[PDB]
Amino acid sequence: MEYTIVVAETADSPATLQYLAPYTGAALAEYFMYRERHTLIIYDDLSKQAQAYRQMSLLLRRPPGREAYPGD
Amino acid sequence: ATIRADEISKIIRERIEGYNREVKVVNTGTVLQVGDGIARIHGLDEVMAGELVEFEEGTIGIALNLESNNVGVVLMGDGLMIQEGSSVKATGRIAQIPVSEAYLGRVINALAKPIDGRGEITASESRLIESPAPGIMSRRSVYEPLQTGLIAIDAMIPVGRGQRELIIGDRQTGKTAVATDTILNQQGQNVICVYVAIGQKASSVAQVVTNFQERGAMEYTIVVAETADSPATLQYLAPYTGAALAEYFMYRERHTLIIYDDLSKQAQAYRQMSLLLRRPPGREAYPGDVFYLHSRLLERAAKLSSLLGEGSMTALPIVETQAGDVSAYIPTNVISITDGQIFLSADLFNAGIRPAINVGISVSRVGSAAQIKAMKKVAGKLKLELAQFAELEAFAQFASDLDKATQNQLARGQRLRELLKQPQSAPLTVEEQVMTIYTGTNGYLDSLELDQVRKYLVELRTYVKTNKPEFQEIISSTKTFTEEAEALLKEAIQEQMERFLL
Amino acid sequence: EKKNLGRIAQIIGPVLDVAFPPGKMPNIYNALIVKGRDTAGQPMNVTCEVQQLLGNNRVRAVAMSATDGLTRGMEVIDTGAPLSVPVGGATLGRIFNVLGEPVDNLGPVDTRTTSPIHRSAPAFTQLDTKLSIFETGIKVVDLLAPYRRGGKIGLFGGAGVGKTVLIMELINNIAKAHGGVSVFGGVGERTREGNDLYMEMKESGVINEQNIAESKVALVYGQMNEPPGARMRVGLTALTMAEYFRDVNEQDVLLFIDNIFRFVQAGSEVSALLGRMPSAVGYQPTLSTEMGSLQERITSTKEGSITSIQAVYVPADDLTDPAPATTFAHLDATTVLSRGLAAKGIYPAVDPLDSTSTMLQPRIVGEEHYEIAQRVKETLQRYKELQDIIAILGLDELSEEDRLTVARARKIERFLSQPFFVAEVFTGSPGKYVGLAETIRGFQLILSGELDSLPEQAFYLVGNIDEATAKAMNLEMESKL
Amino acid sequence: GLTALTMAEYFRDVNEQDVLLFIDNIFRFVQAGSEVSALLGRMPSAVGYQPTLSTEMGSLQERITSTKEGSITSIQAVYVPADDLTDPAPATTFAHLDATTVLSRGLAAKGIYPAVDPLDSTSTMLQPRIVGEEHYEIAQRVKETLQRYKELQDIIAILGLDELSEEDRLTVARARKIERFLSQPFFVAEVFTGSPGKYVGLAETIRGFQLILSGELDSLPEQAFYLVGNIDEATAKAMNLEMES
Amino acid sequence: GLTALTMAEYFRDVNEQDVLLFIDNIFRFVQAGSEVSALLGRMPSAVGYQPTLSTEMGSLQERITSTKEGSITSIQAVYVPADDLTDPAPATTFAHLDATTVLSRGLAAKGIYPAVDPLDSTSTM
Amino acid sequence: ASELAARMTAMSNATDNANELKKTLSINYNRARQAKITGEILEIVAGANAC
């Protein structure tokens, strides 16, 4: 735990926070990376972020694609 | 539904300016909302459905959807330089193409406009693109052959004049060698060929047209060419203009032939057009009207009765399959429309059996009515012996009854396989076909060498063409395999055998 | 092109709606730069392309860059032309994005010549109807799976086999053998792989870094970090850079594409964003037309010839999926790259039997070339069938015709190797160019019993069968000594 | 379809005649209804059919009945698209028909003409009170041996006939004899084969299959049964085959 | 389900005792949402469910928790439609359960009741 | 030795029949996969258009 940061957004969170969590993880690791350090980031179930983004994209009445996932 | 396309501000301002008056915009329509293969037009109050409209860029259109306030026309090209708000003009004419006897030798871009570079084509404008098909009283049973020049087709899948015969296979399996073979074999007969290239790459169209010009077949052939970089509307509409061009010659007592290369590509263009117009699609995203798309096109290939001049149009549509998928949607559509198919097979094509007709799964529902007496009399035994070979080569790896089967398969089947194979762009006349089937299936070519069969057959062919002019006369006179031609061919093949043994 | 100024009306992802003066709005396929504003405190513009006219003075565009930080009411500048990229010898040895901007940080490129990426193909009259054979100088490709000038070729080798070394050898060989140039188009290029490729091109001498414009390649990069508009149009940018070298300079150009499946993938993405109804397996309804409008400009005119070598990815390993099925309607030849041959050191790792070509026909390549290539195929196939029996019985318990077949096949399989000019930098062997004539004259000798008293390690990693006999004499001197 | 049905219904009602109504491809009725219903502004059903598909079928098929005046014996072809028997249009036709006949692409490509699949082709008149008990028992045993054959088909596809038991291989041989004897030459297909069509009565068919299933005709070739009728001709063809050799 | 869960929340929090919460098919708690979702004007998700399947399931499943002042052991029955374990409604529960107990139909078809699939039903304890 | 030869021939035939069956089953699988994807997206798009 002395060299680790844990970004946790559990499944009761809104879709926006589960969509934003890997980006805050990457931003923290990017701070440490650009200050000449070596980092390591683990995205646990990127598919869960894809599902959160699909939920918010469908709720914003955007055109769906395959498996109702948006085009982007 | 609370919004329309005619609800732009200029139309409403012109409505508010004068509410009650007399004269509407008769032939002046202003384009608005240029979309994706469609353009909506406010105006054109007296336009017809099916009417050609003309844009300021020069693009042709067709009034398809005539709603209350705006008509929606389909763009017959890339509608790129259609300025929004520009004028549109009706022509008063339902969709037509100029037809003439002077289209022979030209290359067309689905609009009866040459992409040939040899100037315009004089014509007398007629022949609506969506002409009605002949009725029931109009046509007649098929009774005369259309010789394709291929031994396998002419011997076991006979095609008559007025018959819709499909060429179904995989990609790079033939079908264009077959189509161009049938076109090049029409040199002596009075047949007006038409080649429609719907979605081919422009290099393949170049190869086909230069082969035609080289071998002399463009004196009776028109080429309607839509390349792969064309709008889906033009690929959709090219076979209909091909059929109209051929019908011009058909209804003037002349026999025509038409080959729709890649009707699956026309169905793919129709799918793109329907999906861009948001119509509900069925299986494999096809619009559901795709059967009608193909059936109203192929139903024009008829054999008109004696009162209608005894014209004809033979159709050789070509359908590609995905890994030999006969049970797909578009293949089964064209199979349910046409009068028999010709199955080419990727295993036999790649394995070397070069006209790769899968004979056991191809039919022709004219048959003996198409074939002449000579080919019937000679090829009955051929299709029987090939039938026997068809189960022998599959089930028996070596044989059952290994002595008679070696006298069966090695003598008949594996030499008839080399007898049926035929090079690219080399048709055979019907006399050479009758002679070659006779020399094989009677039992005479049962003791040759498996690589010397071809050389023996070609040399015997030229020999009988050079030293027996009376056999060709007595086959071209009655088209029947008399005993005199039979006996003289027997002694001629003995002569040629003793000549070639050395 | 003038004061045709638009204002953003909608921002929904990377798809914009722009409003215009009532008489002046761009055509479809027309660039428009969004004079946007970065939050940091500087202006920054975003390039978009018109896709559709929507009605009352309103179009719908697709951004080539990201649309974050854009407000409604930003000034959109109509440009009256399609996306214009720099062309000519000024684009050589440099890296470009989809907009023709340099991204290699070497400096600016002079827009002395700018061609549009949206252009119609050559005319049916201007097409060349000849069936020429593109000669790569590689023995296996020239002999067994010949290339066409003006045609397309599909790379099917997975990751880790000699793919990048192969395309670098093709670039160097089209530069040194013919007077041609090459244009690499990276559709969906991973950024670290892009940097590795650029470094290896600098190192292999393809990109002359000590003097640019002596280079043999132009790099265009449409990366995965980029929106689906850029990743779709980067192939058209690369094809325009190649078409300039064909049209104006009359060269034999070599247009390398990365996975043409990601071209189709970006197309399906932009169609899902624009809201059109999907096609059969979910692809864009304009699939075949979107593919053909690209592939029809890779032809051979009366001036030069573009030959494309497109990597092809098959989703779910089936060739009946619409993106492989519509790509294969344009491929003239096919080279598969073998993991097993890359393992056992038969670089270049092209599979000889699974690589196909429609150029391999007597009418096109000569009856001699056709018959010798078919005999080599039969020999290798017989050896492949006989490996299990040789594992069980051995070479001794075979027959004599089968034993000579096996030995000739081992020699042929080792003769399909080649030392590369660009793989020399770590292997050391000087690298050889072998024309087709020496290839067929060497295989005639290795197939008829004229060179059977030689070691198998004498034909391996040579070109030009005289070198095989010379290395054989040296390997025999190793024994005499 | 409606106007042909009206013409037939007039003979059924007023003339009180027993009418035949041969309809070719009642599927295209459904298909054209779907084609217009897309343009009529309706949300489509499962596979893009019209939402009024079942009722459009029933409003036509429920007028083809036998009242006290007459009888309309209608024989209808029903196309299945892409050989998909679970399609909405044939799957809604199945509920209206009372004697089906399903044709197989495999049996057609094997030259077994007509290509009637023996196990999917059912009827509501195969009951012992309607067709007697002998016909019913022979049809039951024929279907039982064909069902056993269809069961072990995959095992004999990978492995082969050499691994079956004695009774199972006897079942295989009798099922091949049965599926060959089910084919017949037609009068209208005399252009496709030659060897003119044979009208085979009912009792002759029952006796022929009784002889196949009884064990008498187990020592004669299968090709004697292919494309014959009235199993006396299968015996004559086996005699001819072993004589001409 | 939220009503019964509230009744269990009170017994865990205010009375501070070990609650045992048995739930019948929580597939029905998601199916009711998918039934009303079209009428709520929401656009449909994958194979036919509401777009908010994962969040709707997650709220209820996350309210079920041992809270270091009292515990709730919750045994939940999850109807898997068409024996399709890759269906979205069971797939989104697999992430919320501790010990999953997958029942096979191939064992019920033999009489291996309780037809608990031994190689499919895993556990984190 | 003759029993082992017969078993070798039977297993060669079984391997070849299993190869052809693997090819046929892969064909039918790819067909069913594309049909499943088509139906899924067409159903989603139909619902989204009705909404």
Ligand SMILES: Nc1ncnc2c1ncn2[C@@H]1O[C@H](COP(=O)(O)OP(=O)(O)OP(=O)(O)O)[C@@H](O)[C@H]1O
């Ligand atoms: N009978 C034949 N003899 C010799 N070569 C042939 C023959 N038929 C075809 N070929 C060769 O095979 C190649 C493919 O044949 P063809 O052009 O007939 O198929 P295709 O219509 O191009 O297939 P697709 O267009 O669907 O890919 C051609 O280049 C042709 O040279």
Ligand SMILES: Nc1ncnc2c1ncn2[C@@H]1O[C@H](COP(=O)(O)OP(=O)(O)O)[C@@H](O)[C@H]1O
């Ligand atoms: N002709 C050759 N001679 C020697 N080594 C080679 C040759 N071709 C490829 N290799 C080796 O095989 C490896 C192939 O890697 P590469 O093709 O660059 O991977 P990728 O296909 O992912 O770009 C390289 O590391 C290279 O060292």
